[PDB]
Design a protein around this ligand. Structure first.
Ligand SMILES: C[C@@H]1C[C@@H]([C@H](O)CC2CC(=O)NC(=O)C2)C(=O)[C@@H](C)C1
Ligand SMILES: [Mg+2]
Ligand SMILES: [Mg+2]
Ligand SMILES: [Mg+2]
Ligand SMILES: [Mg+2]
Ligand SMILES: [Mg+2]
Ligand SMILES: [Mg+2]
Ligand SMILES: [Mg+2]
Ligand SMILES: [Mg+2]
Ligand SMILES: [Mg+2]
Ligand SMILES: [Mg+2]
Ligand SMILES: [Mg+2]
Ligand SMILES: [Mg+2]
Ligand SMILES: [Mg+2]
Ligand SMILES: [Mg+2]
Ligand SMILES: [Mg+2]
Ligand SMILES: [Mg+2]
Ligand SMILES: [Mg+2]
Ligand SMILES: [Mg+2]
Ligand SMILES: [Mg+2]
Ligand SMILES: [Mg+2]
Ligand SMILES: [Mg+2]
Ligand SMILES: [Mg+2]
Ligand SMILES: [Mg+2]
Ligand SMILES: [Mg+2]
Ligand SMILES: [Mg+2]
Ligand SMILES: [Mg+2]
Ligand SMILES: [Mg+2]
Ligand SMILES: [Mg+2]
Ligand SMILES: [Mg+2]
Ligand SMILES: [Mg+2]
Ligand SMILES: [Mg+2]
Ligand SMILES: [Mg+2]
Ligand SMILES: [Mg+2]
Ligand SMILES: [Mg+2]
Ligand SMILES: [Mg+2]
Ligand SMILES: [Mg+2]
Ligand SMILES: [Mg+2]
Ligand SMILES: [Mg+2]
Ligand SMILES: [Mg+2]
Ligand SMILES: [Mg+2]
Ligand SMILES: [Mg+2]
Ligand SMILES: [Mg+2]
Ligand SMILES: [Mg+2]
Ligand SMILES: [Mg+2]
Ligand SMILES: [Mg+2]
Ligand SMILES: [Mg+2]
Ligand SMILES: [Mg+2]
Ligand SMILES: [Mg+2]
Ligand SMILES: [Mg+2]
Ligand SMILES: [Mg+2]
Ligand SMILES: [Mg+2]
Ligand SMILES: [Mg+2]
Ligand SMILES: [Mg+2]
Ligand SMILES: [Mg+2]
Ligand SMILES: [Mg+2]
Ligand SMILES: [Mg+2]
Ligand SMILES: [Mg+2]
Ligand SMILES: [Mg+2]
Ligand SMILES: [Mg+2]
Ligand SMILES: [Mg+2]
Ligand SMILES: [Mg+2]
Ligand SMILES: [Mg+2]
Ligand SMILES: [Mg+2]
Ligand SMILES: [Mg+2]
Ligand SMILES: [Mg+2]
Ligand SMILES: [Zn+2]
Lengths: 98, 50, 251
RNA sequence: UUGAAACACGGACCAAGGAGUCUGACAUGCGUGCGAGUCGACGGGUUCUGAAACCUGGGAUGCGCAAGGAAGCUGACGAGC
RNA sequence: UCGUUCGUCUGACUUGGGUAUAGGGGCGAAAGACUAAUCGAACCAUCUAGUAGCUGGUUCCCUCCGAAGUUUCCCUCAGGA
RNA sequence: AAACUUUAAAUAGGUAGGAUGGCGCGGCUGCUUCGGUGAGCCGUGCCAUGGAAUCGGGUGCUCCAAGUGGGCCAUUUUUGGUAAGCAGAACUGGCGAUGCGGGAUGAACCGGAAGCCGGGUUACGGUGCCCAACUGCGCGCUAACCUAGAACCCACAAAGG
RNA sequence: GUGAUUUCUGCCCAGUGCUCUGAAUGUCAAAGUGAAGAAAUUCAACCAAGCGCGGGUAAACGGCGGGAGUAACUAUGACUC
RNA sequence: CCGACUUUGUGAAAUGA
RNA sequence: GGGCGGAAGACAUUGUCAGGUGGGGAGUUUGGCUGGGGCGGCCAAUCUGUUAAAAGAUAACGCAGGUGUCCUAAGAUGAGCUCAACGAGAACAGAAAUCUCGUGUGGAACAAAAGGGUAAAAGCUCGUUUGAUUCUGAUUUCCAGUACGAAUACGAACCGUGAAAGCGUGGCCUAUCGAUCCUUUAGAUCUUCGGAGUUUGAAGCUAGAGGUGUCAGAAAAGUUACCACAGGGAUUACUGGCUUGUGGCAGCCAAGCGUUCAUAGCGACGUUGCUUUUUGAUCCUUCGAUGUCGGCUCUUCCUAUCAUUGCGAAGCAGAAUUCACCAAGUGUUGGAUUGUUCACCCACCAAUAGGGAACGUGAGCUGGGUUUAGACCGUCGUGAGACAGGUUAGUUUUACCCU
RNA sequence: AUGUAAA
RNA sequence: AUCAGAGUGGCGCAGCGGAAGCGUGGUGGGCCCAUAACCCACAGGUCCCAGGAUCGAAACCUGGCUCUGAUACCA
């Protein structure tokens, strides 16, 4: 699945409010912070004896991930994100169909 | 022993013993969901009666 | 599972040494002025059989160096001692069989027995029936010496350590087949309750790692790690190899 | 139990004991008192058979009379067919 | 347990008293055997009226009304919403 | 020709058969139109013999809640199976929860549903005895030297002579 | 572990396990060090055993193949691929 | 099993700073 | 000489953290459906056609199949053209390369399964594009009329295309996907950190993703023949019941065999039945126990007759043998081997027929087999262990009640 | 690697 | 009875749609007196049978055939 490097789409930022010109990136999860409440709770709960307290997931069954496109328009430099359907082979601005 | 059972037996008998309840016909049938372009105008028109 | 036969031995309940008719410890004399700077004459009175041990034991009657009484010491018999023999104990005692000398007085190649390890620990090496240690070399800049032990292991020992000249008597005792459960039983009665021994493969899993199964077989590698927890360190502990030894493997 | 007189299970007979109770919260329904109030329930004073009864506080204790928001906050300008 | 018939009987022999090892422990010439008629985890008391979607029982009369084994979801199919 | 169809039943299915209708008049619209042009509403005034048949008070509105959530039999349609007192479905009724009269006996087949009594008449089923009712009045068929034959389900018999 | 005696114990270290060796420039914690920051903190380098990589071990656990054609009667197949 | 801190003090050299 | 004598020596070691190993040990799990369970499979999410009985709904481990994707175009729009195939034709050129004309209701194509639908299009080519966008509601489908997914119709924006009407909120429609908590991102120059501020961090609100396929979403391997408790005849194996595929039996027609001759005796292709000793199917009674194979003993009954009495027929000369009839009164044996029923031999015999009686018969026996616990071999499993594989040892209780 | 039985 | 696996040169076998090979075997020369052996050349196949999709098949899916390997247990 191919996505153009740049797409004309709506921008809800109060100062665009119109179809402007958006760059395309691909969403990658930011690395997990160690100061989140869920982590200073999971660490505390996990300390001491008792072993594993929160369940750990094993039965992975999917084989695709819903790609998220972080479209940045260059009229206010504000991102907005849109999810595309589940896909395996994904590429932004790939060589077009001949 | 076959855990799966499914019948329509007796179902009409249970249905018809408290009747097939028709909801009451109402004067001023409800306008919920009608075309809001029409409903805005109707509300304004009722607003400006004499 | 339950505690294994090999773990059960650490309590002593039925596994302590049968030590009722033993004749006391077999060891040298207390190291002192006379035995350090000269020689002491002891007369061997009788060579007794010590129950539970393969070697004869020679009772030796010294005269106490500084107070008026005898001293019945009890040595491990070196092959050759007979009642009435004078055994000499000290540094400047001549080198003859039965005498006890420091290793500073024993030339290279000498065959000795009942060796000390820390000077004065009263003799610990080469005591079993028919075992000796060969004194290999002397370093006089350290005051130390080297010896070849019965195991073939080669050890550095302090040079002021005593050692009985000769080899332990009763040699070749283990050369005779016992031919009988009887002889085995009477051997181990006066040593300790470690006989008969039941093959773990003929046990149930609850008491031995090898047990169980419709057939009699170990089931997994019979060699266990050095660090295996007790009750699992059973079999061939930390084996470096297995199989019948051939060639240099038996050197 | 779809199906018991069943070759389904319990019961030889008699007598006595024997199994939806108590407590907390909530809710509907009903009765009583008061009714934008209502509760005196923890205390206090009394109390001549009394662990009762009667009095007392409350000007804000509980609930109710205001709600929407996560929160900062804001908080019903008066109904016609 | 009894009867007859059997095995061994100088030996790894038969046995009394004293004594040691106590419960996930002991002891086992290994049968999961024995550990006080109890052992693939003794016995005694307590937590304890353990829990149970399962079996059994569930106490007076008359009058009146009076069904379901079907939908949906659930590690759900003997169950519950 | 179930996974073919031009055509195309029966049975069943949906809607309508007025008083919650219609017309006239003058008012609003931020909708709608080239536009009083529509669409809708609002105030007011008029008309509307009840607008097929039959029957009848209603869940009409609400609350709280019990039990149930193992089903089975039958006629018809019907899937798998060789068939099944077999398994799974459709419409209906019965049994379960139900006595009562008949089918000799049977949970669901036939009649029929019930307070307790007297009187009469019946349904299904019968009238030789058991057993209340006729060896009733008629007409034929059958002769079984196989236990002739004799009740919807039903307790069976065939092909063939 | 096997089980007197006699006779003999064949092949396989790929797999699992056991063990041995550590040049170091794989991975690899707490501590300890440096840098950024106003500080919490982050980032970096360094980083033990362990694992990895490399050898030994079968009287360690264990394992130990197929398909075709061929002899001058026929059959088989010494032999060959 | 091994690593660090601790009991844990003294002075000496060689390589890094 | 104020050192008891040596050894090692600030290393071992003690304590606290740190990482690895750790069935030696603890705790715990080891889904569901299911014509018993196990193995298999998915009929657990889900789509098309049929079953489905002409509205809707409608099941089975029913049937034929599909889905966990693919796509910046195979989405949106506009314009032009017509497709598969056939017919006649044109150097090399043939059955098939490229071109031209004629016919062409779709016999092509539309990403895929199957159904439906589409022809100046929903197909092919070309131009331009991103409506595959934003805000929250409403409805349909499943539905309890909850959610999710998907779809539909308006509204308020912003745009694409066309000249314009319009069309466009992804794929022509029907399937192609996801809760709470946690993490992470996007947004407001948003809200809080509760003594007041600057200031990192954190906590929020709205909208997405990280995924639960057991798909309304626990984090999870076996074995037990040493086993246990609750229960189940909702559910298996013995008997019984219905059924009779299958096992056994017997009719009808007559192509032929029977040296000639269909029917002495058979009777193929077909076809109709009977039986409940086999096996199968079911799961109706029985799991608060109906004592489970065989043999010994002993009794009774059936006929689908082996001999025995009487008969009829013959390819019946006699002898013997075959077919059938009335016929169940009488009889149907001793042994080798196997636990065996069954089998198969030796011999006698007139004959060595078949069967039923809760596969007659264990408070009648036996205990050989099978079917606990011991044990051995083999194959399997890493292991505990398994074997509808082989072998050995293995308690057989009660009557005095009623009949 | 080897060499008619056909004298 | 179900479930896998494999059907390719004469034999045993490699193969991932553009598409066929490996050893050996066979055919013709060469060396030798002659046969091997050795050197140099030559030709291969119904990619098990029958369909479909696919630019493009022997491979991809399916139906039919033949062999082999497993699982067929508690009673
Ligand atoms: C990896 C993460 C796992 C999972 C989540 O962390 C598990 C949670 C959710 C839940 O059910 N309650 C818990 O405590 C565990 C989740 O949300 C996925 C999207 C992705
Ligand atoms: Mg959060
Ligand atoms: Mg803490
Ligand atoms: Mg910790
Ligand atoms: Mg059910
Ligand atoms: Mg012993
Ligand atoms: Mg031994
Ligand atoms: Mg032994
Ligand atoms: Mg054993
Ligand atoms: Mg163990
Ligand atoms: Mg074992
Ligand atoms: Mg029942
Ligand atoms: Mg009965
Ligand atoms: Mg019971
Ligand atoms: Mg009883
Ligand atoms: Mg108040
Ligand atoms: Mg009113
Ligand atoms: Mg006796
Ligand atoms: Mg004794
Ligand atoms: Mg004793
Ligand atoms: Mg006992
Ligand atoms: Mg109780
Ligand atoms: Mg109790
Ligand atoms: Mg029950
Ligand atoms: Mg309920
Ligand atoms: Mg009609
Ligand atoms: Mg009932
Ligand atoms: Mg009457
Ligand atoms: Mg009468
Ligand atoms: Mg032995
Ligand atoms: Mg190996
Ligand atoms: Mg190895
Ligand atoms: Mg670190
Ligand atoms: Mg390292
Ligand atoms: Mg465990
Ligand atoms: Mg199950
Ligand atoms: Mg099954
Ligand atoms: Mg219909
Ligand atoms: Mg329909
Ligand atoms: Mg067009
Ligand atoms: Mg919805
Ligand atoms: Mg629009
Ligand atoms: Mg399209
Ligand atoms: Mg669409
Ligand atoms: Mg999500
Ligand atoms: Mg504060
Ligand atoms: Mg679910
Ligand atoms: Mg377990
Ligand atoms: Mg055992
Ligand atoms: Mg039959
Ligand atoms: Mg038959
Ligand atoms: Mg049953
Ligand atoms: Mg039973
Ligand atoms: Mg019983
Ligand atoms: Mg009985
Ligand atoms: Mg009984
Ligand atoms: Mg007869
Ligand atoms: Mg009996
Ligand atoms: Mg037996
Ligand atoms: Mg056994
Ligand atoms: Mg094995
Ligand atoms: Mg067996
Ligand atoms: Mg078995
Ligand atoms: Mg030759
Ligand atoms: Mg040639
Ligand atoms: Mg040649
Ligand atoms: Zn913008």
């Amino acid at each position: 699945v191919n996505v153009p490097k740049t797409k004309k789409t709506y921008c809800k930022n109060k100062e665009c409010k119109k179809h402007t010109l958006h760059k395309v990136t691909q969403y990658k999860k930011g690395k997990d912070s160690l100061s989140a409440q869920g982590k200073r709770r999971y660490d505390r709960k996990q300390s001491g004896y008792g072993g594993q307290t929160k369940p750990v997931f094993h039965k992975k069954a999917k084989t695709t991930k819903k790609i998220v496109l972080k479209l940045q328009c260059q009229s206010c430099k504000h991102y907005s994100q849109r999810a595309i359907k589940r896909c395996k082979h994904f590429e932004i601005g790939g060589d077009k169909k001949g | 022993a076959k855990s799966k059972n499914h019948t329509a037996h007796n179902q009409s008998y249970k249905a018809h013993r408290n009747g097939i309840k028709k909801p009451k016909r109402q004067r001023q049938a409800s306008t919920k969901g009608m075309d809001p372009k029409f409903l805005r105008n109707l509300r304004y028109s009722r607003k400006h009666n004499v | 599972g339950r505690v294994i036969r090999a773990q059960r031995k650490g309590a002593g309940s039925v596994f302590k040494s049968h030590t009722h008719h033993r004749k006391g410890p077999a060891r040298f004399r207390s190291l002192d002025f006379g035995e350090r700077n000269g020689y002491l004459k002891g007369v061997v009175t009788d060579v007794i059989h010590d129950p539970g041990r393969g070697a004869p034991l020679a009772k030796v009657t010294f005269r106490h160096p500084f107070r008026y009484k005898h001293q019945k010491e009890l040595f491990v018999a070196a092959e050759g001692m007979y009642t009435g023999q004078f055994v000499y104990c000290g540094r400047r005692a001549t080198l003859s069989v039965g005498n006890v000398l420091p290793l500073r007085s024993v030339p290279e190649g000498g065959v000795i027995c009942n060796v000390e390890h820390h000077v004065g620990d009263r003799g610990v090496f080469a005591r079993a029936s028919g075992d000796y240690a060969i004194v290999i070399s002397h370093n006089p800049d350290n005051g130390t010496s080297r010896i070849k032990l019965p195991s073939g292991a080669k050890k550095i020992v302090p040079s002021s350590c005593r050692a009985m000249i000769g080899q332990v008597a009763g040699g070749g005792r283990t050369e005779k087949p016992m031919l009988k459960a009887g002889n085995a039983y009477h051997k181990y009665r006066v040593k300790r309750n470690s006989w008969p021994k039941v093959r773990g493969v003929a046990m149930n899993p609850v008491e031995h790692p090898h047990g169980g199964g419709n057939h009699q077989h170990i089931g997994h590698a019979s060699t266990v790690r050095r660090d295996a927890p007790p009750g699992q360190k059973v079999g061939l502990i930390a084996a470096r190899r297995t199989g019948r030894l051939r060639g240099q493997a038996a050197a």
